[PDB]
Every structure is written in C-alpha cells, then in structure tokens.
C-alpha cells in the first residue's frame, strides 16, 4: 500500500482514523531510521528553524518511547503538535524551533499527554497533480 | 531501481557520473511535480529560510528550462549551488534564503554557467544504517 498520509486529526480520534488518511505514498519506509510508519502534515511554522515548514510531511515512527532532545509528535488534550521534547519528571516541555513561539509546559498530573511518535524525517513534495 | 543520489560532484564532470552516485532510493518520482529525476545532497544553510537544510536531499527535475523566481541547481565554474534564480541578460543573480548569505553574481561572459535542473522537492532522511 505505502505510507499513509495523516492530515488534520479530529479531537478524540486516533491518528490513523480512516477519514484522516488523505492518501498513501510509495516511499521506502526503511529509508528512515527507525521506520516511517506514517506521514503527518505539518501545520505551522513552529519548527521552521530546523526545516519543518508548513505543508511539509513529517515522517513518524509510531512509539511512546522517545528520549529528550528529540522531535516528537504529541497530543495535549487533543492538540496534535510537533515539538522537541524536554521532560523533567512530571514537567514535560514541548519546545518549538522558532523565536516567535513560546514553549508548551505540561504538568502530567493535570493534563492528559500522549507521545504519538518519533519524527524520523521530512518529505516535501507539493501538489503533484 | 529508483532515484539516484549525488553528493560532491567532480569539477568538470557530469553530475550523474557514476562516481558521484551515492545510492538509489526507492521513492515515487511522480510524487514530485514535475518528476524528480535525481536527489542532490544539500551542502550549507544558504536556503535555511525556505526549509532546505544542510544534508537534505533535494528532489531535482533535470532541465534547463527554468524561469526567474524558481529554485534551481546551477553550476558556476565547477561549483554546484542550490539558489533562487534572477537572470537579467548576461547578469545572472543566484539569490539565497538566509540573511547571512549574499547574492552570487555570475557574468556569463567571464565564467561558465549551466543550469542542471529545477528543485521540485526535499527528502530529509538520515543514515538509515
């Protein structure tokens, strides 16, 4: 089939929900380390300093196991975001790569927080038809 | 066998010379419009502001028919660069996307200038092994 294309994810719904999948791309998953499980459309210039521009497809490996300093896809009360991880105990900080955005601070005690996957790369094609 | 990968190209040797081919990636060429013909490793942060980063693989359509405004791969006297085109006569101006970088001015009389192709996308993957 190929790598699914997850666009904007409705609140509550899982990422790979059938009505979020706007295509399947024939990219060799193992070109990414670890494997690309899906491609998520980046929305925002929250990450532009490292080259994750709006409309980019992020290559994501589906895991909850991510270490600090890594770019993660996260959910904060149904807000699928792409930031860098700095967790200190119950203090999870989702840092952006842009001087116009301020960090997201999450207290695991208060907010519901899920790591959806690891950023393993970027595919930037446009519209191809 | 899919898109070839070209790194440092030899001074005065074709870009897709076997010696420069650092591998063949299985990516759907037609995921890019127009078709990606090859991938070139990007050297330097000249284009950091459009999202083209050092080490990125630029998806390039092999052509010479490029119009002003486009991002192109160009060879200026044995050096290959990825820049935005602004040709006005025998004065071609290869513009960057980074304030720390200054436009290149090629004088078609004095130096050799070829257009290798058109930038049609970007793949950012790492070493995968």
């Amino acid at each position: 089939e190929g790598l699914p294309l997850v666009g904007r994810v409705a609140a509550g719904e899982p990422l790979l929900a059938q009505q979020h999948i706007e295509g399947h791309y024939q990219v060799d998953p193992s070109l990414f380390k670890p494997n690309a499980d899906f491609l998520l459309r980046v929305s925002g210039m929250s990450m532009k300093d490292i080259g994750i521009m709006d409309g980019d497809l992020l290559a994501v490996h589906k895991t909850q196991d991510v270490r600090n300093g890594q770019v993660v896809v996260a959910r904060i009360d149904d807000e699928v975001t792409v930031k860098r991880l700095k967790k200190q105990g119950n203090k999870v900080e989702l840092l952006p790569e842009n001087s116009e955005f301020k960090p997201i601070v999450v207290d695991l005690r208060q907010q519901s927080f899920t790591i959806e996957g690891l950023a393993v790369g970027v595919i930037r094609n446009g519209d191809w038809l | 066998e899919g898109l070839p990968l070209v790194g440092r190209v030899a001074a005065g040797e074709p870009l897709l010379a076997q010696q420069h081919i650092e591998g063949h990636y299985q990516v759907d060429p037609s995921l890019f419009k127009p078709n990606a013909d090859f991938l070139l490793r990007v050297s330097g942060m000249s284009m950091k502001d459009i999202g083209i980063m050092d080490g990125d693989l630029l998806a390039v359509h092999k052509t010479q028919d490029v119009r002003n405004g486009q991002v192109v791969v160009a060879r200026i006297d044995d050096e290959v660069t990825v820049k935005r085109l602004k040709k006005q006569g025998n004065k071609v101006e290869l513009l960057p996307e980074n304030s720390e970088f200054k436009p290149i001015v090629v004088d078609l009389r004095q130096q050799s200038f070829t257009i290798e192709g058109l930038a049609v996308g970007v793949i950012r993957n790492g070493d995968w092994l």
Epitope: S30, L31, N35 | G2, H24, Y25
Partner: nanobody, 122 residues
C-alpha cells in the same frame, strides 16, 4: 536469538576485487536494513554500504561507484562487491543490521557481526 553470519574478505593488491556477504538468522519478524560499516586503526567506524528490503541503496564518499550492495530477501542475505580496492580500504568491515526480532514486536534493534578484515597491499 538473531545473528549476523559474515562471509568473505582477506587480502588483495590494488585494483583488486573482493566479495563480502552477510546473512541474518534467527527469530526475525522484519529486516529493515542490512549493510556494512568499517573501522580503521585509530579512526572511527564509518558506513560503507546499506540496502533496504525494497532495494534502496546508500554508499559513502570513498566508494565512488566501485562497490555494489545487493540482496536476496528469500535468503536474508546481502552481498557487497568491492571492485577497485585501494590501500585506503584496509579495515575491519563489520556487517550491521536493523532488525525487528519477533521477540520485540514493533521495536527494531541494531545488530552487528564479528568483523571481517579487508587488507589491500602493494
């Protein structure tokens, strides 16, 4: 239990060819990528060549179209034909692999081989 069985190497003189081979055996769910690294005395380990199951290949600078990595998915084996060996190519060549063992479904791990010495002389 999974393993990288290496096969080949030794010495040649300059411009000499040498076939390397490496297979992965055991409780494997998925081979994501196999290939070869190398270590020269004093210097660090560098990638030589890599191949995925779909046929994607990557090579380092120093291989200028003189090496060719290939695979037999049914034999879980990869082969590297090195062709125009230079004295700069002398090193231990460790087969490396990215494998999901069926032990740990979904997680991949790095696996290494014993190391085979390639020596190029004059």
């Amino acid at each position: 239990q999974v393993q990288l069985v290496e096969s080949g190497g030794g010495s040649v003189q300059a411009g000499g060819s040498l076939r390397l081979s490496c297979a992965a055996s055991g409780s494997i769910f998925s081979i994501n990528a196999m290939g070869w690294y190398r270590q020269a005395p004093g210097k660090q380990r560098e990638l030589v060549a890599a191949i995925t199951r779909r046929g994607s290949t990557n090579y380092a600078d120093f291989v200028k179209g003189r090496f060719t990595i290939s695979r037999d998915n049914a034999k879980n084996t990869v082969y590297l034909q090195m062709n125009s060996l230079k004295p700069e190519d002398t090193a231990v060549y460790y087969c490396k692999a990215r494998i999901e063992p069926d032990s740990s479904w979904g997680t991949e791990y790095e696996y290494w081989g014993q190391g085979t010495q390639v020596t190029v002389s004059s």
